[PDB]
Ligand SMILES: *[C@@H]1O[C@@H](C)[C@@H](O)[C@@H](O[C@@H]2O[C@H](CO)[C@@H](O)[C@H](O)[C@H]2O)[C@@H]1O
């Protein structure tokens with residue numbers, strides 16, 4: 001005993017975790033002339049809203065710093081997110097070590113705590129020169145994320161980019177032209193790289209829900225002649241029928 005229904009699946013919800021390398025290897029001139037415009041062009045291409053893309057943003061250096069939480073004003077309003085980038089241009093100087101594993105671990109923590117939206121595509125954008133505090137540890141956590149169906153895109157930034165590491169953590173194959181998971185040019189190429197990951201595509205599918213067993217049919221409304229009775233059941237799903245009335249006859253009336 002189940003119920004079938006039609007619905008549209010568009011995958012419009014995306015939790016996008018932007019992890020930004022703010023470590024000392026990035027280089028200040030690179031930060032100003034390349035990273036900031038990268039962030040502006042990238043975030044400007046993201047049509048954030050309550051119902052679709054929600055941005056999370058972390059800056060990782062010696063420590064990790066959570067800049068934007070999923071669901072807040074700055075998470076769902078592109079203009080507010082761009083203000084954060086401006087704040088970083090004016091007040092942040094890249095310095096220190098590179099807590100890439102800890103930053104990826106913040107994504108893990110979202111999944112573990114069930115803070116993400118269950119129906120949302122989980123998308124990590126890792127923006128880095130690819131020189132983490134520990135290569136093995138960063139690969140390990142990235143691989144754990146992938147095994148939980150999290151998509152990972154890598155954007156190369158910084159004065160001295162380790163493309164080999166970036167390509168490895170992104171999952172790029174050797175002898176393969178134009179990896180779909182790694183980009184290291186300008187914001188235009190980054191935007192184009194991200195697009196297929198977040199595209200809304202609507203299909204119409206059928207769905208099945210289990211409504212469970214019915215309660216016993218009640219006694220007939222009349223003890224003689226033609227009457228009615230009913231059976232009920234708790235709603236285990238929105239589109240499950242909960243009540244049901246049929247006719248009955250307890251003989252004839254004298
Ligand atoms: C249940 O027991 C039966 C043997 C009858 O005595 C039923 O009574 C009758 O109820 C019907 C309507 O259901 C009336 O139209 C009759 O006038 C009445 O005798 C009793 O409810």
Ligand SMILES: [Cl-]
Pocket residue numbers: 098099100101102132133134135137138
């Ligand atoms: Cl690390």
Ligand SMILES: [Mg+2]
Pocket residue numbers: 023024025026096097098131132
């Ligand atoms: Mg570094």
